[PDB]
Amino acid sequence: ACDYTCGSNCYSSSDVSTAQAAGYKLHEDGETVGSNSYPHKYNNYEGFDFSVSSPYYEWPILSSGDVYSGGSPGADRVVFNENNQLAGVITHTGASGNNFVECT
Numbered sequence: 001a002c003d004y005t006c007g008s009n010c011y012s013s014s015d016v017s018t019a020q021a022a023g024y025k026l027h028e029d030g031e032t033v034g035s036n037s038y039p040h041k042y043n044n045y046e047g048f049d050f051s052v053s054s055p056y057y058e059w060p061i062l063s064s065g066d067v068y069s070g071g072s073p074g075a076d077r078v079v080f081n082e083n084n085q086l087a088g089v090i091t092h093t094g095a096s097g098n099n100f101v102e103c104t
């Protein structure tokens with residue numbers, strides 16, 4: 001069973017925790033990776049009900065289980081805040097353009 005389903009991708013809570021840890025560390029270091037410079041700020045214009053406060057930041061989560069290191073980020077993301085609290089798992093899959101929907 002998947003703790004989060006993004007389209008056809010299944011993630012366990014460990015896969016979320018591992019990607020969040022990596023992304024938070026780059027945030028603390030003032031560093032980014034990838035042509036699109038992740039982690040970067042996330043603005044919640046779609047109004048997802050995140051129960052943690054912003055600012056929010058997004059970091060790719062990979063279906064492969066590997067930590068994102070540059071290269072294609074795929075469509076899935078972990079969102080965390082300034083206090084390293086998990087806000088949610090969203091994806092561009094099934095959303096028009098560069099918009100998002102939440103993973104279920």
Ligand SMILES: Nc1ncnc2c1ncn2[C@@H]1O[C@H](CO)[C@@H](O)[C@H]1OP(=O)(O)O
Pocket residue numbers: 036058073074075076092093097098099
């Ligand atoms: N797999 C993907 N599907 C849809 N949008 C993509 C995507 N990969 C990157 N993006 C979006 O492409 C745009 C320009 O790179 C950014 O808004 C970026 O959003 P993100 O960084 O929030 O994912």
Ligand SMILES: [Ca+2]
Pocket residue numbers: 010011012015064065
């Ligand atoms: Ca996994």
